[PDB]
Amino acid sequence: SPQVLSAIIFIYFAALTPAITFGGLLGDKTENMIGVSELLLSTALQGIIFSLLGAQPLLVLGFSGPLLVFEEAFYSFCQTNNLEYIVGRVWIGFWLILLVVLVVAFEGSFLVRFISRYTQEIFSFLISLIFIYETFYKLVTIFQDHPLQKNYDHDVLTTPKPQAALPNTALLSLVLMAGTFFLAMMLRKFKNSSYFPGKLRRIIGDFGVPISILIMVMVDALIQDTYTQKLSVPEGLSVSNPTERDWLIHPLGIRVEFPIWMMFASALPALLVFILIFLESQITTLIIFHLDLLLIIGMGGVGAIFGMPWLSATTVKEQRISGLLVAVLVGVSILMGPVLRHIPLAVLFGIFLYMGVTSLSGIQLFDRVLLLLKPRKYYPEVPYARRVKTWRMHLFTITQIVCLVVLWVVRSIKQISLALPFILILTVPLRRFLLPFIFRDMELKLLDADD
Amino acid sequence: SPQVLSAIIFIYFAALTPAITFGGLLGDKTENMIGVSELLLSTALQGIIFSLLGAQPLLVLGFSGPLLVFEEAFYSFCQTNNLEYIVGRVWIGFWLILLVVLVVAFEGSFLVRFISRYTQEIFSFLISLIFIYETFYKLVTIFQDHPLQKNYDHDVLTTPKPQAALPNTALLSLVLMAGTFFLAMMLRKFKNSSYFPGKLRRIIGDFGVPISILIMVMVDALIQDTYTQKLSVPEGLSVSNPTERDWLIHPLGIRVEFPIWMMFASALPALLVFILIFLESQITTLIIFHLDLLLIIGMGGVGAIFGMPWLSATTVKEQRISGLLVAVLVGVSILMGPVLRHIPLAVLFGIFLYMGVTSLSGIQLFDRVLLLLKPRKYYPEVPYARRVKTWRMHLFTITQIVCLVVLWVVRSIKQISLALPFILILTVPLRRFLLPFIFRDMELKLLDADD
């Protein structure tokens, strides 16, 4: 049917846009171990093996920011002490497996009843802040790798990586990253404009991210005499750096024996995986049970066997075939390596920043963070700003900002890390115990009352 | 008084912002003959010698876009046949002088009664289109002067001008031009926002252009190892390229005798100067007369004696001292050459584009040019869109677009030029004779009825 023909490409683009950029981000946050080929394959089988078994086969299992934060933190920790990033993570997966049985025997979704706005708008807000900060850290690395000079050197080999500073890169990349973001923002506003009649508009506006990558892929295509960093994509059905990893992974290590005292001490880096996948797994279920989430947990654990990052829930009869088709198309997408390698990394990072910005404006916390600076004579009329004293509003925002700073500090120091979720989850008692001691109940039902 | 102390700096910045950028534009549109030192001095004496004698001493005599268009057209024509740009223009000034007497004897401001919206919104709209097109022509010249490569050469001398292509310029300039414009737009929106209380906001917002040049002057200051094109400013009270021109100009030429058959055939390039200065001289007088304009005409003619471009009217008791002070400060401003030469040209061109954009949104013609593309179900409610048939509105815009294209073609071809004003003024009969034959009087009083 014509409806399906359009819907399947719509969902295909919506699901393919984040995967490639996250694969590139992982390719840079690690040496080259985890990239696009395995990640794009990670969600390929996952689609079908969730569509076959699932309460809601209309959902999409994409890759989310918090998971990436956890893996980059793990890589940072994995380098403080000599450890194999791939191999150790594998054991984490096995630990997840034994957590599956303990919840299959008896449900453990009680915490869903204790999750509120104070928690999911301080956590998501932090994610929208790590995305913006992440792209500004790359400019520093670029300016140090290719510093601005006027002499340079002749004929530097660059096939594996630029061996020395060369011109037209430190600030060409800046143009490329700042161009995609600008075009994406303009098309986002286009979708919410009055140019062109109705549907004939939103057909293109709804494809802003998929469309605002090709313009400046062509830009790099038309500029070939200047080198730019691009994606690291191996051949079809192949693992990037096949001399460093294989499809089948040996738990005892590939090159160096994995330390003995790590086999059974990997429980801690696994319950946190479970917590992160759990918290995000209910935000996307409020659009409208236990087995649906337990399958996701076990299947993410399975993904740790051959070396694929685990997936997480995302946004949204013939229900089965939709997931079937999206999964098979994603799987076949990895055969376009020769044309997929022309995409430069700065374009992906610009799309990443665009993701980090749009997700920020939808959070209701920011709408009052700005009001803090706003003078108290232009406040918008919302039924939580006229029934509450003005000098009490700013106090709540300060209570949230202090927690935000506390969370940020932990994410900054390299030594003490991998505990951001542990320090974040204990904010729920702060909301359930400390907050009811300072604010009145009839006032608190308007600041952090989730709908 | 404190009021004066703030007002004088306010007007000083408002009058100094356009002069520097126009001087740079002239420095590039000519070899180096006319630049900033003489132009910034051109309006220095002019301020006092108009404040002393003038009907409204509160006005400001700045440099406008159409005049610059005329001078660049004259330079283009001056190169088709071997002629001295400075010397020939001098004679034009003398011609303007004899036009002064003919109008002093009897007034000639009749055409003011025949100027309407159809004329000053098709002319100003074009000006806002050259400004945008002008800055996009420079990128082509830059990419041809410094093409993108990866080998380049070592140690190129650049003191008078870059003798060969060097890195970090073809697209650094792009960052610099696109940065000032973005910041200026953001601060323009800042002035129309609700951040910060009332006046404490608009004090900075009203200085958007003066403030959004220093940030990225500092950017170039912090990047000194990469060369960028900058202003050509000579020492204090000196003419740029003093081996090519002097303060006192000899009408028979400096290096080559000026052709004889040009002395008395320069009337045509002078009546057009008069027409351009006339048409703009009434748009700024409708905010609420002959000698006031005749003085401007004669004084612009005087400016052609020592080699300064003529000035034109612009936007807006102690009235005298304001002009006195603004003039003396402008005159003294030319002593800051050592610090004024650090400003790069791309910054000035970005400010030029900003000027070309803001002036575009204020024209009521554009507000319906966009409606042409708008579907006929979101039209704004203005008392000229509900009393007129929709299919008749687009016709008027087409009648204006065809004239716009006709005007653009003339400005494009190099051979046939210097006649844009001649072909534009005869649009007034088109408005007074052709238009009343196709549209009804009771319908025409809502499309081009000036207030």
Of B124, B20, B22, B67, which Cα lies nearest the Cα of B342?
B20
* Burial label, B10 (beta-carbon count in 10 A; 0-12, 13-18, 19+): middle
A47 and A99 part of one domain: yes
A328 and A373 part of one domain: no
The residues pairing with B230 across neighbouring beta strands, listed in sequence order, are B344
**Cα–Cα dist A427/A117, whole Å:** 12
Q: Which residues of B touch A225 (CB under 8 A)?
A: 148-150
Distances (CA, A) of B252 to B259, B268, B269: 9, 20, 18
Sign of torsion over alpha carbons A216, A220, A223, A226: positive
**Cα–Cα dist B110/B443, whole Å:** 26
> Which residue matches tokens 């876009």?
B65
CB contact under 8 A, B171 and A168: yes
DSSP letter, residue B432: I
Rg (CA), chain A: 23
CB contact under 8 A, B151 and A148: no
Domains: count for chain B: 2
Report yes or no: A254 and A246 within 8 Å, Cβ to Cβ.
yes
- Assigned domain for A36 exists: yes
Report yes or no: A349 and A138 within 8 Å, Cβ to Cβ.
yes
Closest Cα of chain A to B193: distance in Å?
Answer: 10
- Max CA distance (Å), chain B: 72
DSSP letter, residue B241: S
> Which residue matches tokens 């970005």?
B350
What per-residue string of b and e applies to B250-287 under the rule 16 or more CB within 10 Å gives b?
eeeeeeeebeeeeeeebeebbebbbbbbbbbbbbbeee
> Which residue matches tokens 């945008």?
B132
Q: Choose, out of B168, B173, B181, B381, the residue to mutate when testing the contact with A (most A CBs < 10 Å).
A: B168
A255 and A379 part of one domain: no
What per-residue string of b and e applies to A302-315 under the rule 16 or more CB within 10 Å gives b?
bbbebbbbbbbbbe
Kindly give, in sequence order, each residue whose CB lies less than 8 Å from that of residue A248, ignoring residues fewer than 6 positions away.
A306
A305 and A385 part of one domain: no
- Assigned domain for B177 exists: no
> Which residue matches tokens 């803090």?
A372
Q: Which residues of A touch B (CB under 8 A)?
A: 148-152, 154-155, 166-168, 171-172, 174-175, 194-198, 223, 225-227, 370, 373-375, 377-378
Report yes or no: A269 and A384 within 8 Å, Cβ to Cβ.
no
- Assigned domain for A353 exists: no
Q: Which residues of A touch B174 (CB under 8 A)?
A: 175
- Assigned domain for A315 exists: yes
**Cα–Cα dist A84/A89, whole Å:** 8
**Cα–Cα dist B72/B59, whole Å:** 26
- How was this structure determined? It was done by cryo-EM
Q: Which residues of A touch B228 (CB under 8 A)?
A: none
Range of the domain at B259: 2-137+231-338
Rg (CA), chain B: 23
Give start and end residues of each alpha helix (H) in A1-64. Answer: 2-29, 37-51
Q: Is A91 helix (H, G, I), strand (E, B) or coil?
A: helix
A257 and A163 part of one domain: yes
> Which residue matches tokens 């600076």?
A373
A171 and A240 part of one domain: yes
CA atoms within 13 A on the CB side of B137: 10
Q: φ and ψ at A62, to 5 degrees?
A: -100, 180
Listed resolution, Å:
4.4
- Assigned domain for A349 exists: no
Of A23, A33, A30, which Cα lies nearest the Cα of A243?
A33
CA angle at residue A184 from A180 to A190, to 5 degrees? 145
Q: In this structure, which amino acid lies at residue A347?
A: V
Report yes or no: A65 and A130 within 8 Å, Cβ to Cβ.
yes
B64 and B133 part of one domain: yes
The DSSP line for B180-208 is HHHHHHHHHHHHTS-SS-HHHHHHHHTTH
A288 and A429 part of one domain: no
- Assigned domain for B409 exists: yes
Report yes or no: A77 and A418 within 8 Å, Cβ to Cβ.
yes
Sign of torsion over alpha carbons B291, B296, B302, B304: negative
**Cα–Cα dist B413/B286, whole Å:** 35
> Which residue matches tokens 């001398």?
B157
Give start and end residues of each alpha helix (H) in B231-336. Answer: 268-283, 291-302, 319-332
B291 and B326 part of one domain: yes
Torsion angle defined by CA atoms of residues B34, B36, B37 and B40, in that order, rounded to the nearest 10 degrees? 110
CA atoms within 13 A on the CB side of B143: 8
* Burial label, B315 (beta-carbon count in 10 A; 0-12, 13-18, 19+): exposed
**Cα–Cα dist B177/B173, whole Å:** 6
**Cα–Cα dist A209/A194, whole Å:** 20
A38 and A151 part of one domain: yes
Report yes or no: B252 and B258 within 8 Å, Cβ to Cβ.
yes
CA B323 distance to own-chain centroid: 21
Kindly give, in sequence order, each residue whose CB lies less than 8 Å from that of residue A308, ignoring residues fewer than 6 positions away.
A38, A39, A41, A42
B320 and B384 part of one domain: no
Kindly give, in sequence order, each residue whose CB lies less than 8 Å from that of residue B402, ignoring residues fewer than 6 positions away.
none
Distances (CA, A) of B21 to A137, B18, B47: 35, 5, 19
User: After which residues does chain B have a break in its backbone, defined as C to next N over 2.5 Å?
Assistant: 288, 316
- Assigned domain for B382 exists: yes
CA atoms within 13 A on the CB side of A414: 7
Q: Which residues of A touch B197 (CB under 8 A)?
A: 375, 377
A299 and A176 part of one domain: yes
- Assigned domain for B368 exists: yes
**Residue that is last in its domain, among A283, A305, A340:** A340
CB contact under 8 A, B166 and A155: no
**Cα–Cα dist B339/B351, whole Å:** 19
Of B24, B16, B20, B26, which Cα lies nearest the Cα of B86?
B26
Report yes or no: A322 and A3 within 8 Å, Cβ to Cβ.
no
